[PDB]
Design a protein around this ligand. Structure first.
Ligand SMILES: Nc1ncnc2c1ncn2[C@@H]1O[C@H](COP(=O)(O)OP(=O)(O)OP(O)(O)=S)[C@@H](O)[C@H]1O
Ligand SMILES: Nc1ncnc2c1ncn2[C@@H]1O[C@H](COP(=O)(O)OP(=O)(O)OP(O)(O)=S)[C@@H](O)[C@H]1O
Ligand SMILES: [Mg+2]
Ligand SMILES: [Mg+2]
Lengths: 124, 328, 124, 216, 72, 72, 72
């Protein structure tokens, strides 16, 4: 009983019914934070940590971060997984690539949506 | 002190004798045999290679080799050699493959030969155990250890998961048989089959079948293979063999021996004796002219074999001398 | 299921035994080659491929090795994870890290047994 | 203390035990070799240097008889070395009495556990040295790890004070004929010193172990 | 399940206040030679705190348990 | 039959008005570490209501029995 | 397709081009000798019966490749 968020449509809720492919790729929620849905991260934005084109990554629905803690932050229309780095009133979407500079987003004009915590990655 | 130790040891030995029998310490002088009693294997190549001039008696023996290598013919030659000595021999086969006409052609007195063809593996082992306990049969040959199908496997259907079932049967059967053989002074010979294993990834991939519980008890394990073939211009009448003593417990191992097998006529001992004598020196050849005692025995191996066959005593003298020089 | 039956060394080979540590709860055929057991990793040899330290690795029981595919080699009583590469009487166990120098194994002199091929990582 | 040494076929187990027996006899001790599979060439033992006439040989028929004989000799406080030729050959009485291919699973293991439980207490008091020689049987379903598994149940590996693992690696040749085989002994367990001290040496046929080359 | 089973009957496992389970998983080597072993103790029964709190520690021959490694 | 038997003679299974048989089948593990056990209680005998009404519930270390779980 | 027994004339063009998957990831020039032949043998052994149960007609198309060595 674990939802596989594989297809991430643009402008769709993190847990939309169309976003779940299922296909019997279902395993129990034994992760410590108790992730409620599996998100497949695409892009080399976290190669240093172990993120790849596949690497089905489990995310636990919760809104909280502290210091250098990776989270699933929503920018409204784009879903991405990057490390979190508070700056008081601006949040930085830290990544791990010489080419991917730490993305600076701030909060006064835009508030990042913390979809869920990134715990566990399943390369499959 | 030392006297006290000796007294205690004597008391313990006496009690062991009284409870179990005369089986705590073998009699010293009694058990002194000049050589281990051996059954000649029909060829000087193996008699010299083994060191004791034949397969040791009272011990499991194991001969394996590729298809059509010469296992069954070698076992039949051993049986004929034992029968000429005057001991009853029993041939138990599992592949139900045996041409008694050909066996009699080799030399085995088929009229007196207890041939059993069990329908199941467990039955063959039971028959061998009974014969061994009978202390009557002196040579036992169990053919195709790979063909002893366990009763469970036969009862089941083709494709069932019966992994390792036969190795258990083989190990258990040996665990029971090994003890009786030494008491009965028998000689059990197993005929395995080479079945290449998987994932070797380099080196010799050949692997004997029938589990690996047989290679610990086997007193002497051979490895018989066919190298070439003897052709009289167009037809083939025999095949050269190469027996390698891969394991041994009565003489140093790896004493490879070679000889020809002639169809119907059996082993070609007459040529082997000539070959040994020529290199030893008792037979002289000036390159390509066979000679003996300064006499041109003739021209050719077949010619030399005929010259020796016309005079059997001449052959026996060379065979006795070569054994006395190499075997002992 | 896929009970964990020991730990593999990413780097210098270490002793490996069959004792079951724990039992996971992911379906057997979650992986394409039908991984049979998860082998706990230990080291940083495959960090360049996304296999860091302490990340349960799924293994498929295969006795045949193909060049360029990561396998679980087993030298003597030691088991290690490396890329397989054989060109004759010698076998090279390449490592995805400059720190770990490739391992040369000569089949003629020392027996090499392959435990299987890796099919994924759990990183729980 | 119990000492158990195992290894594949023709690895040198019997030869190593005979060398130990020779050393014990030379020191002036009484040794007893309780063969199991009725496999022993007294001529070869005499060649190795062990005084056969001083050596006590047994040919137990069943496993219980062999174990009882070993216990009696140990209790005698006479024999200082006892060698049991094989542990896979100690057929339990019930198994030999019964028919072939029966489901007599565990009988040998229970027999071995009982024998060890009874013998370990007497050995220390009697200052003997019982050496069990074991064989190698591939464990099915192991997959990961070493399939090799010694036979005769797993109660011997708890009492065994020091367990060796002797394998035959090479073969010494005079150009064409083999006269001795390289051997590698690995101390896989030990209670009296650090384990895993693998040591290599040569076994020349007839002449025993090649101590002289080892010293060089 | 687990075929492994302690010995000496099953009357001791009731009275046993806390039952450990020591297993020697790895081996620690100084270059080539082994100087210690890697244990893994699992509290499989406990009447003084929740069970199954397995702890790992390295044991060095002669020097005893390697506490200084655990402390770091 | 079933080899498992109680101790203390069999004069207690006659007077005992109701006899339970509590076994611990599963273990509820939160994430990686276990925090509770899946017990099952079967009323093997009873003299006030029908027997063999086996019931299951969760037991949480420290807090006790997880009443809300089976209530829901 | 053959399993469904719907399509009954299947044409497989250029048997030569069925590059094995395990070799597509392999580097150029690797001496993967016989892999394609093994693939073809397995495929034929796997689908030589399903054709009979249906009326399909699997038509392969191979190519000429002069061999070296003996030229009788
Ligand atoms: N009746 C026969 N007539 C002629 N040649 C025979 C006959 N039986 C066996 N041979 C040959 O004898 C040689 C040795 O074969 P055998 O040892 O008798 O049988 P085998 O090959 O050992 O048994 P397998 O099938 O290999 S286990 C081969 O070249 C056979 O072709
Ligand atoms: N009588 C003998 N003459 C020459 N070499 C022998 C003799 N007996 C044994 N050997 C060799 O001595 C080496 C050690 O083998 P042994 O210890 O005698 O038997 P083994 O090692 O017990 O074999 P198993 O199956 O383990 S009992 C091997 O290379 C044997 O071939
Ligand atoms: Mg035959
Ligand atoms: Mg021996």
């Amino acid at each position: 009983g674990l939802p596989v968020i594989g297809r991430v449509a643009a402008g769709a809720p993190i847990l939309a019914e169309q976003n779940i492919e299922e296909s019997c790729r279902i395993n129990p929620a034994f992760f410590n934070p108790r992730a409620d849905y599996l998100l497949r991260v695409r892009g080399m934005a976290m190669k240093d940590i172990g993120i790849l084109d596949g690497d089905l990554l489990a995310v636990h629905v919760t809104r909280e971060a502290r210091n250098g803690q990776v989270v699933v932050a929503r920018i409204g229309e784009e879903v991405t997984v990057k490390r979190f780095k508070r700056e008081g009133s601006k949040v930085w979407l830290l990544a791990e690539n010489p080419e991917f500079a730490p993305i600076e987003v701030d909060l006064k004009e835009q508030e990042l949506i913390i979809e869920g915590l990134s715990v566990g990655v399943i390369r499959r | 002190g030392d006297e006290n130790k000796k007294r205690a040891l004597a008391a313990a030995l006496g009690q062991i004798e009284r409870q179990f029998g005369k089986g705590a310490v073998m009699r010293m002088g009694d058990h002194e045999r000049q050589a281990i009693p051996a059954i000649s294997t029909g060829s000087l190549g193996l008699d010299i290679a083994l060191g004791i001039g034949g397969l040791p008696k009272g011990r499991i023996v194991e001969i394996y080799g590729p298809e059509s290598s010469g296992k069954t013919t070698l076992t039949l030659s051993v049986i004929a050699e034992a029968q000429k000595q005057g001991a009853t021999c029993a041939f138990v086969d599992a592949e139900h493959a045996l041409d008694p006409d050909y066996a009699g052609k080799l030399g085995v007195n088929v009229d007196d030969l207890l041939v059993s063809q069990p329908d199941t593996g467990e039955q063959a082992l039971e028959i061998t155990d009974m014969l061994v306990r009978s202390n009557a049969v002196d040579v036992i040959i169990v053919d195709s250890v790979a063909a002893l199908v366990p009763k469970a496997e036969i009862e089941g259907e083709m494709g069932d998961a019966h992994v390792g079932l036969q190795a258990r049967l083989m190990s258990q059967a040996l665990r029971k048989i090994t003890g009786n053989i030494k008491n009965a002074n028998c000689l059990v010979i197993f005929i395995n089959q080479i079945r290449m294993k998987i994932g070797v990834m380099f080196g010799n991939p050949e692997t004997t079948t029938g589990g690996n519980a047989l290679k610990f008890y086997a007193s002497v394990r051979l490895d018989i293979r066919r190298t070439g073939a003897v052709k009289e211009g167009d037809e083939v009448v025999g095949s050269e063999t190469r027996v390698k003593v891969v394991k041994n417990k009565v003489s140093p191992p790896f004493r490879q021996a070679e000889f020809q097998i002639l169809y119907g006529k059996g082993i070609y001992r007459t040529g082997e004796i000539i070959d040994l004598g020529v290199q030893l020196g008792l037979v002289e050849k000036s390159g390509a002219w066979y000679s003996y005692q300064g006499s041109k025995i003739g021209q050719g191996k077949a010619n030399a074999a005929k010259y020796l066959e016309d005079n059997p005593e001449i052959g026996s003298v060379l065979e006795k001398t070569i054994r006395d020089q190499l075997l002992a």
